[PDB]
Amino acid sequence: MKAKELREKSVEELNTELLNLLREQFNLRMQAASGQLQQSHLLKQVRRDVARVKTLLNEKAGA
Amino acid sequence: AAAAAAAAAAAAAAAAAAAA
Amino acid sequence: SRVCQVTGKRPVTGNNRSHALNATKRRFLPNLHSHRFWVESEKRFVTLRVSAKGMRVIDKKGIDTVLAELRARGEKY
């Protein structure tokens, strides 16, 4: 989330984000991409959450 | 329903003058 | 290029005008000669390409003064 991510410290978000992308977005991105569940709505989010994580931490200058 | 049409302007002359 | 480097005279241009008044562009070029002037305050040769109005200036105003200039004025010492 927004402020969720914002109150998390540098070290934290770093190991969380490999996850977000890989094997919390990767699983979606393959399944969907071949049609198994048309839970199409799930991509939009997550993507726009893995963005967030990469915004922060760097822009916090290691906070 | 495409269209393409040009205009032509090239010569049909080949025949040569009479009595110079 | 064809600049005096004492005053930096560029070639002016203008029309000839003949004994029947026939204008035609023709270029008024300064004299220009490469002359090895003797600093005497570094005691070396500073071959500069300068005109022959130009040369008179260098001798009259003094060596280390046109050499002051040029370098202060943006063209190669």
Binding site: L22, M30, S34 | - | -
Partner: protein, 93 residues
């Protein structure tokens, strides 16, 4: 990591659609839609980490699209890469 998760992002989707990849799935190997990114090595290290299928070379090949739909403005597909995964002993698992 041996190389970034940026290049553990190449795989975006499975392609195994039809022949020569069904034929070559029964027979041996898997095939999968791989980005456009252009390498072999980071792909070889991709189907390993991600998944756990054992491989030994990758065959890489640009897919150059074709012209398509609409006479109201004639279009052509975006290009990508197909890669034959080239399973080593991954064909059993």
């Amino acid at each position: 990591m041996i190389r970034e998760e940026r290049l553990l992002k190449v795989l975006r989707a499975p392609h195994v659609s039809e022949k020569a990849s069904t034929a070559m799935e029964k027979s041996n190997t898997i095939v999968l839609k791989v980005a456009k990114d252009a390498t072999k090595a980071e792909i070889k290290a991709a189907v390993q980490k991600l998944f756990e299928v054992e491989v030994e070379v990758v065959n890489t090949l640009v897919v150059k699209g074709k012209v398509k739909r609409h006479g109201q403005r004639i279009g052509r597909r975006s290009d990508w890469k197909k890669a034959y995964v080239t399973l080593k002993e991954g064909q059993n698992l």
